[PDB]
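Predict the assembly for these four chains.
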Amino acid sequence: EIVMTQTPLSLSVTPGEPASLSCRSSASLLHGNGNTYLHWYLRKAGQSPQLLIFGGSKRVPGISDRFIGSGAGTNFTLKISSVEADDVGFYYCAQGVAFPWTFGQGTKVEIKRAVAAPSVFIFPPSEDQVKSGTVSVVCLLNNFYPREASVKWKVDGVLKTGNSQESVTEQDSKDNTYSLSSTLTLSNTDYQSHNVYACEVTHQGLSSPVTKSFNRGE
Amino acid sequence: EIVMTQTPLSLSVTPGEPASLSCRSSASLLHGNGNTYLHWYLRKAGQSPQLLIFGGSKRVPGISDRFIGSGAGTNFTLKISSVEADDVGFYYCAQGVAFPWTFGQGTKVEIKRAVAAPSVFIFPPSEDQVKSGTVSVVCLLNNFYPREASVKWKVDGVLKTGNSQESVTEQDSKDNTYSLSSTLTLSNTDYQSHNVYACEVTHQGLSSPVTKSFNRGE
Amino acid sequence: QDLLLQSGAEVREPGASVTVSCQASNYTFPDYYIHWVRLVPGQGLEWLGEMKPKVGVTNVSKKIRDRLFMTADTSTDTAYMVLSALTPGDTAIYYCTRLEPDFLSGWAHWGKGVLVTVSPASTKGPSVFPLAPSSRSTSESTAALGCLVKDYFPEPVTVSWNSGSLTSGVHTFPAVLQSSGLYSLSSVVTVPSSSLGTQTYVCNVNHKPSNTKVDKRVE
Amino acid sequence: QDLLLQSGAEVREPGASVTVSCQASNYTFPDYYIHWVRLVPGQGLEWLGEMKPKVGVTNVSKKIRDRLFMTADTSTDTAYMVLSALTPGDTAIYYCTRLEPDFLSGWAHWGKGVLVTVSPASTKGPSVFPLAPSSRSTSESTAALGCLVKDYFPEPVTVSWNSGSLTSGVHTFPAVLQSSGLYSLSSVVTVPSSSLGTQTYVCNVNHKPSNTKVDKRVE
């Protein structure tokens, strides 16, 4: 029930910049006294969160330079003065309020980059996988930015059945780009039910739509 | 520590038969407040343990008073006036007031039955095991009494080596004979080196040991 | 009725851990003393520990004690025990027990038990195998027909003959864990060998711990 | 500063009851509260419960109050958390929290949180194939190696190329649930067309509990 709106919901930014995050609520935020209060923390590659604010203004001991924020009760907001590569992850705030208490949804933080198209690939299903009776093919999109590309498929030139699923890399460790896999799935007989298999793309780093294909019996 | 034994270890008992078991303790059990505190328990195959008698001789409600028993401080006995099929099971004895770490090792009721030779069969497994790298040759020793039989293999006139596996009925539901499956099992190589295969058998109800046999291919 | 509920079985890798639970019947839960005890395969019964709910632990075997942990919740009216550093030979039917009246005179009492099992293995579908109509060359008048499993894991296994539609004169030789760390089983039916009705003798078998079903008849 | 100990994962059938357990650092251990937080996939974190082991007490989320039970072994402060009637929706990572005698007026640091996952599934080694598989012809410059993991359970998997002798340009897509509850994954390596038209390439894949290796050579 206790409101916690955390925003921007996601963020991408360049190194050395200022950036800020806002937490908004329904009430004042204590277990008692009139006087216990909110805290903020960073979660990454499956480690627990790392505490950053302990109590509104209160910086956690031994942590970074100032992520510190301001506001009270219904309002609070962090600001960091400088983007470090260290900082990418999930940020969220917690209230210092009487429990039961609830996290707000979390705020994503990333590096910003120049827009850049993927290299794009598709291929026939391997014939062992074909005669496995259930079959799949993959549209692959290596090393591109941002991960806001969008991907399509056509079979005998007409859009896919929806028997398809997708996955993206993490933000690249250094290039801070991404890659995408889209997979389309068939029975061997659905794989007969069309001949040419295609995947098609539009993206920020695309000047114009891109198309790739294979045709079976080759 | 409480250290104790119970006997006889097992017996096949004739229908209608008066019978008993004795529990013998190295600890003299004038328990707690100078008062002997000892008990006996049933169990059956797939069943919870079941109360019988306690304080030595005191019966739990609903027991057939066919069951009887009592004992001096190291020297205790459980008894039955008679035998009916419902008696076939396992029987235990133990100790208590604050220090419950004890059991008698269990003793098994069977029923006494007319002697009987088994019917016996054996088979060559199909090539489908042979081509899968492992050969089990199995011999079936069915409906024998008393409880004991010995089983053996020969290959090309030469006795067993290495592996065997065996498995037996709980006496019976009905006739109260026993039935036994057993095998010698090999890498297919070994069977391919071999040419003739036999099981061999002996038991109380036989004139002589018994062979069943076959040869590779036929 | 005077009962403790206990539930479905368990299996683990060596070095792991296990949780076992028991639930009271409609009763004044805190007033029982409880033993945890076990039946170990091919081996004698064994008391482990004693617990009174709001007290928690009371007495326990020094052997198990450090590996053991034992407790209860009043809110649910349930006992637990936990075993840490879990290993082969700990494999047993664990029982919680009810003690309350003249139980000093001996009165441990029972729930249905729970099976715990330990292996290096992971689940495997059955090496189901038919057992031949041998001596079709030579039978006088009598026969038996068989079916087998090997390297299935973990047990138990469902088994049937004529797909359950006719079942008599039959043995179901209890399975054994092989040196593979996986199970072998066979069942066999006795037959007057004049039976051309042997056409019907589909042995049919099922393996819920591996979500699997299979069938054969041979002649 | 110094961290609580909290061990590795487990995988489960629906409706079961299932546990995680956690242990004190170089630390006193009855003295301060414990909290349990659920990290749910794709979604914001979730407080379940406060606990204090000293008395064996808690304050609890109204989303539950039913399926949970919690305490610790006072012999070690080995925390236990018990959940029951587990849905696939409970598939999550569970984090064992201390609380810090001042900083808990906000919060405190944790040990390493642990995964548990719920599904009618059962173990499978992956089906495995090439993908790319080679450029039959293109604007030769670079292309990529690629290999498929499919029909697999449970995740995760371990993967490498030319036994991980190759490392540059290698990528690995995060896992996808197949509608059967199985997994697919994939790996790819962008490489010069000159190199690709010359050297031999293999995708090298391993996991337990499948106990299975594949080393798929590719063209």
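Chains C and A do not touch (no CB pair under 8 Å). The radius of gyration of chain C is 23 Å.
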